[PDB]
A paper describes a structure:
The systemic RNAi-defective (SID) transmembrane family member 2 (SIDT2) is a putative nucleic acid channel or transporter that plays essential roles in nucleic acid transport and lipid metabolism. Here, we report the cryo-electron microscopy (EM) structures of human SIDT2, which forms a tightly packed dimer with extensive interactions mediated by two previously uncharacterized extracellular/luminal β-strand-rich domains and the unique transmembrane domain (TMD). The TMD of each SIDT2 protomer contains eleven transmembrane helices (TMs), and no discernible nucleic acid conduction pathway has been identified within the TMD, suggesting that it may act as a transporter. Notably, SIDT2 can hydrolyze C18 ceramide into sphingosine and fatty acid with a slow rate.
The apoSIDT2-pH 7.4, apoSIDT2-pH 5.5, and SIDT2-pH 5.5 plus miRNA structures were determined at overall resolutions of 3.16 Å, 3.21 Å, and 2.87 Å, respectively. The 2.87 Å EM map displays excellent main chain connectivity and side chain densities for almost all residues of the extracellular/luminal domain (ECD) of SIDT2. Based on the structure of AF-SIDT2, a portion of the CTD was predicted to be located in the dimer interface, suggesting that the additional area of density is more likely a portion of the CTD. It has been reported that an arginine-rich motif in the CTD is capable of binding nucleic acids.
Author numbering:
A (entry chain B), B (entry chain A): 24 to 321, 450 to 653, 685 to 832
């Protein structure tokens, strides 16, 4: 009538090969002595031998304050009614902190089945000598979809923040790495892991910044859970029998992970970064002040477009950043988690200080255009013959545009670097096209006075490039057919604009111009970055940096000669452009289909432990732009007495 | 030595009052006969009497294919280390479909504790005669945070979609209502419920549209889970002892819910809606064709701004809609779920057809301005004296702006109505300010020819209103201090613009103008809607609809007389404005802090079972705008012979 019930004492680190049926329940009693200042983990492992799909085993682990249960072989789900079946299951047991200095704690394991056949299982309860993580010591382990793991880290003395870096040398088991507090239970299942805490799907890398003020116990759990399907990490899926009713044996895929918890930049990294920024971008101001005191003693549309954008920029990103602030789902903003230093609510504060160069060099330029205009008007009371003939008609209206577009760049990008994304991308790099545009009009608008009608001619072209990026944005991972057709339609524009400016060197002019477009084509074809609007920016400068040379070479072959004061700004502008494009090309693939794949491109800080490569791009770009404004400005200053060459140049 | 183990037969619908200690385990054996075409639910209920916090009961329900376990009193968590403790727990048992026509199925209940004191519990397994929901029949039930519930709905014959409407006559227990398939297990816990399926947090209402193609079993589970804290529904929290270590007794709060699953519009509602739209908006075209054949026989900035917006509009919302498409978290887009008819990937397709009036009446207007220009130029070959003196200088350049801004409105709003939101709001209503702006310039630019300098004067003002909405957007739930200070700064603008146009009626002019601003102030102060940019739109038309009257009243007191052809468009424009503002004011509070609160304002469809109030607003607004363009156009057609009154009017 009544079932057998076998109660038997058991021991740690000793494997039991028993069996149960529908008329048999096995109960094992384990005990262990726990101590306050040395915590251990108890990991139960079950494994059924050559089991038929009739009816599973039912395993219950009973502790003083918790009941855990599962059924073996454990069945997990897929997307489209796909079941995966695991013969072997494991769990680390959650247990609350011990109230005494040391106490004996019992727990029980209960094995029962409702199938009428002898089912042979294999049980083993082991003690983990590696449960407590250490600061600065790599630790490696294994996990599968039926064997989730978790470890404990407790903060050292006086360390107020850490970063947990987890790495894997192989791509496709997926994973979720959650960071939870040390209160039982622990949510280490495919459906519990995203309930609370802050987490990150990985493929090869994950990195999470943790601070004490979120964990009043001064400790937390790092939880690793492997997933049954790799779609969330950019992987494909097969199904030969998978969609059928029966489950699919999937116990053959493991993930081998390494975890390292290391201290973060304490506080003086922030001071060093701020002092570096201020020093380098005020050296320019001091240099200009001394330069002036030496040498002297020897419109609304651009702002409104940004204003009618910045508020949508401010509102969109803030409404989008707050999710990770409250949800902990860190697969939403595409930071560089290995170099991302929080301040207040900002996650990557260093990716915002970097945009101080645009602000403070777009403001130093406006203080040059203003000083040139004022000085020129202070000359107009003396009435020298150089009104507009002995020199060139001064049109600062589009200088002010250049000096104020550089300012808005240090706000469109500083606000974009709050949660970089795909929907969020167009704010920063697309507005550098404007500066690229204005740097082209000047050299045209210098040899052609009545170009105010042509000023609006280029305004139409700028939206097309934004539309072209938008057209590329419509399919961010578009096929080659999009890429090559855009590549070939690029090829037409090579000779198309070359004809506008066109005599031996003009036939030589076609040599370097067409090559670069052809050169830049292949590096696009072979790579095809997910980021396209950033790609075309490179074509922007490369043609722009070429077109300076053309204006010089034609000027090189006249009686007009280049003075050093507007020449020393040509070599240094090109040197900084060379460096700036090096760090620009470092991060160009570091944005891909999914955050898991976009995260295996992260890399540590470089400068003062604070700034990465993309911060060094915000630095050199704002100096190259400013270094190019003074080229357009000073270049033709030797023509302060000539009225024939300047007038009949074009 | 070994524990007692009591195995005892049990019965449904009969309560057991037993006790266990650390040396006693109780096991109850239940059985029940299940049948294929009649499914029942088995609900286990446990309740501990006057239990001390020493060590809980541990309850295990063991079935053939599933093990369920919990611990009583059950502890749930809060946000800031807050624990809530429930003495009574209940679960409905998941069970896979029976393979035979009828079979006997056993399950077991296992009660055990590790505390050394007699703990007295109360167990009851009951059978539910109300597990299978029916189509079109309200069903009411109770639930708490420790007693989650779920019911089964199986599709009737030939019904391809249903809507599940759940309602509660009281606000603050929160809830999550998930819709899952009928494969075990069921995720009805505070941490499982959001794993899969599509769900909705409610406060008083929820409504979810379900389609067979997602559920190949032709059935699903409606799962209701009550939450321990009401922050996600806009509620506050107390904590007198709550933040302390001990848990808080919280078994005193219930939620009483009603569930109704009703069939959705089959297919001809879509046909009726499309036919209605086409008929009403082509009656205008046919009417104009007959009107012309009767009577005759008797620039880039506006598009570029939208183009540099529409692509960000298209990209942002599409990148934002796809989340609910793949996540099922329907607390992301602020639809009207009671009237939201899907088509393809679009969730609310009727909120897009409604924007056909802007497209097809912004296009019919451009075919009037074009015909007036062509006819006028076909007259300029005859050279009548009415070039610009006997009439008024024709400036269609800003007519084209009006006729093309109405077109872009039917795309900015049609794209906004793909996931209405807070970040997403500015796209639709802010661009109706432009049409409101251009409707003001015409009457000004008719009495003042050289107003091209004043054309850009108002362009600055438009961004300020957008900035004012943005300033209001920065704190969407801002305090009164924002609201009243903006209200009083409004009061200055009352007399400020009144002075611009200013004689007895001009002193009367101050009567109605200031009152409306004062009138519109209180209805803002008393209500203070979360939607502010939509509020100021009302102030937009109200002043705009007033300023038409002023131009008439001054015209009413001259020798100039109003012909009926430009008068019959004045009464009908005002009638449609009156109706349009009625349906506009229906949905004005239907957007609040949280989607749960924003959803208790939903209301059923009105017209042809397809269009709600806000669709009737897209309909009447596009006819009122068009009805106002023909006022600005035809009004002063009687001045086709006068050159004194027109010239010296202003
Ligand atoms: C707690 O468990 C330990 C096992 O880890 C028990 O110690 C064993 O007791 C059995 C009883 O005969 C024998 O195998 C040995 O005496 C012990 N083996 C080892 C490896 O220590 C211990 O008795 C248990 N304590 C209680 C109170 O049950
Ligand atoms: C994690 O799993 C890997 C894969 O099984 C283990 O590496 C293997 O260990 C066995 C034991 O001798 C051998 O087959 C080889 O040494 C390893 N095979 C390889 C690397 O292909 C590894 O030992 C497991 N444990 C850890 C901590 O990594
Ligand atoms: C299945 O459970 C039912 C109870 O629902 C059992 O029927 C009862 O059996 C006990 C045994 O003495 C008595 O209370 C009555 O004979 C029955 N009561 C009722 C209300 O039916 C039944 O015996 C069980 N079947 C098996 C095979 O165990
Ligand atoms: C749901 O819970 C409510 C609240 O307890 C129940 O309504 C009460 O029922 C008891 C039973 O007689 C009485 O106190 C009153 O009839 C009700 N009190 C009220 C309405 O304040 C209700 O019966 C429960 N069940 C359902 C299906 O609603
Ligand atoms: C288990 O039950 C069987 C009855 O089938 C009987 O051998 C005895 O009661 C139990 N066995 C032992 C070893 O106690
Ligand atoms: C800390 O643990 C060690 C382990 O040997 C032992 O001295 C004792 O259990 C604890 N002592 C203190 C001072 O915490
Ligand atoms: C150790 O735990 C026991 C529980 O039985 C209890 O007496 C107390 O918490 C601790 N012992 C002492 C002497 O404090
Ligand atoms: C295995 O089955 C045999 C009979 O087939 C019987 O001895 C018992 O059910 C099982 N043996 C065990 C549990 O040792
Ligand atoms: C329960 O165990 C006790 C020993 O404390 C003893 O009465 C007997 O073995 C069991 N009771 C019954 C009624 O079988
Ligand atoms: C359906 O259920 C009824 C219940 O009385 C019974 O006729 C039988 O179990 C089933 N019959 C068919 C035809 O499915
Ligand atoms: C009913 O279930 C039993 C399980 O014991 C099995 O014989 C079969 O699935 C069904 N019976 C028949 C006669 O088909
Ligand atoms: C209640 O406790 C008494 C002794 O305090 C003992 O009879 C047994 O543990 C409990 N009584 C039951 C289970 O009937
Ligand atoms: Zn950047
Ligand atoms: Zn609308």
């Amino acid at each position: 009538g009544p079932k057998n019930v076998s109660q038997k004492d058991a021991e740690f680190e000793r494997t039991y090969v028993d069996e149960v049926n529908s008329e048999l329940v096995n109960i094992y009693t384990f005990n262990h002595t726990v101590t306050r200042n040395r915590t251990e983990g108890v990991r139960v492992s079950v494994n059924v031998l050559n089991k038929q799909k009739g009816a599973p085993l039912l395993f219950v682990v009973r502790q003083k304050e918790a009941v855990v249960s599962f059924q073996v072989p454990l069945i997990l789900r897929g997307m489209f009614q796909r079941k995966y079946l695991y013969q072997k299951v494991e769990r680390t047991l959650c247990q609350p902190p011990t109230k005494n200095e040391s106490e004996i704690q019992f727990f029980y394991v209960d094995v029962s089945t409702l199938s009428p056949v002898n089912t042979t299982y294999q049980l083993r309860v082991s003690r983990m000598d590696d449960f407590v993580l250490r600061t600065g010591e790599q630790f490696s382990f294994n996990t599968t979809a039926a064997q989730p793991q978790y470890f404990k880290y407790e903060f050292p003395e006086g360390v107020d923040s850490v970063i947990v870096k987890v790495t894997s040398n192989k791509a496709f088991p997926c994973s979720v790495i959650s960071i939870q507090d040390v209160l039982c239970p622990v949510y280490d299942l495919d459906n519990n892991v995203a309930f609370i805490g802050m987490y990150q799907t990985m493929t090869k890398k994950a990195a999470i910044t943790v601070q004490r003020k979120d964990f009043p116990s001064n400790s937390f759990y790092v939880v690793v859970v492997v997933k049954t399907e790799d779609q969330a990490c950019g992987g494909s899926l097969p199904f030969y029998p998978f969609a059928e009713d029966e489950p699919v044996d999937q116990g053959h895929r493991q993930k081998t992970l390494s975890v390292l918890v290391s201290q973060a930049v304490t506080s003086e990294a922030y001071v060093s970064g701020m002092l570096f920024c201020l020093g380098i971008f005020l050296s320019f101001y001091l240099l200009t002040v001394l330069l002036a005191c030496w040498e002297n003693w020897r419109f609304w549309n651009i702002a409104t477009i940004a204003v009618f954008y910045a508020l949508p920029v401010v509102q969109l990103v803030i409404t989008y950043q707050t999710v990770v602030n409250v949800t902990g789902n860190q697969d939403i903003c595409y930071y560089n988690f290995l170099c991302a230093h929080p301040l207040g609510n900002l996650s990557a504060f260093n990716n915002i200080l970097s945009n101080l160069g645009y602000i403070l060099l777009g403001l130093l330029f406006l203080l040059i255009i203003l000083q040139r205009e004022i000085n020129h008007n202070r000359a107009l009371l003396r009435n020298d013959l150089c009104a507009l003939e002995c020199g060139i008609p001064k049109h600062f209206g589009l200088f002010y545009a250049m000096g104020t577009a550089l300012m808005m760049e240090g706000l469109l990008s500083a606000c974009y670097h709050v949660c970089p994304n795909y929907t969020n991308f167009q704010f920063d790099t697309s507005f550098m096209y404007m500066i690229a545009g204005l740097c082209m009009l000047k050299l045209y608008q210098k040899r052609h006075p009545d170009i105010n009608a042509s000023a609006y001619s280029a305004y139409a072209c700028l939206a097309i490039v934004i539309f072209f990026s938008v057209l590329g944005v419509v399919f961010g991972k578009g096929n080659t057919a999009f890429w090559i057709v855009f590549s070939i339609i690029h090829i037409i524009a090579t000779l198309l604009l070359s004809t506008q400016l066109y005599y031996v060197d003009r036939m030589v002019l076609l040599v370097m111009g067409n090559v670069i477009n052809w050169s830049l084509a292949a590096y696009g074809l072979i790579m095809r970055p997910n980021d396209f609007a950033s790609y075309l920016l490179a074509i922007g400068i490369c043609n722009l940096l070429l077109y300076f040379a053309f204006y010089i070479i034609m000027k090189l072959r006249s009686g007009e000669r280049i003075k050093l004061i507007p020449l020393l700004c040509i070599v240094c502008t090109s040197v900084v452009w060379g460096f700036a494009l090096f760090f620009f090309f470092q991060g160009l693939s570091t944005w891909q289909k999914t955050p898991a794949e976009s995260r295996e491109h992260n890399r540590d800080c470089i400068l003062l432990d604070f700034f990465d490569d993309h911060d060094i791009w915000h630095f050199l770009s704002s100096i190259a732009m400013f270094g190019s404004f003074l080229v357009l400005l000073t270049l033709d200053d030797d023509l302060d007495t000539v009225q024939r060459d300047k007038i009949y140049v074009f």
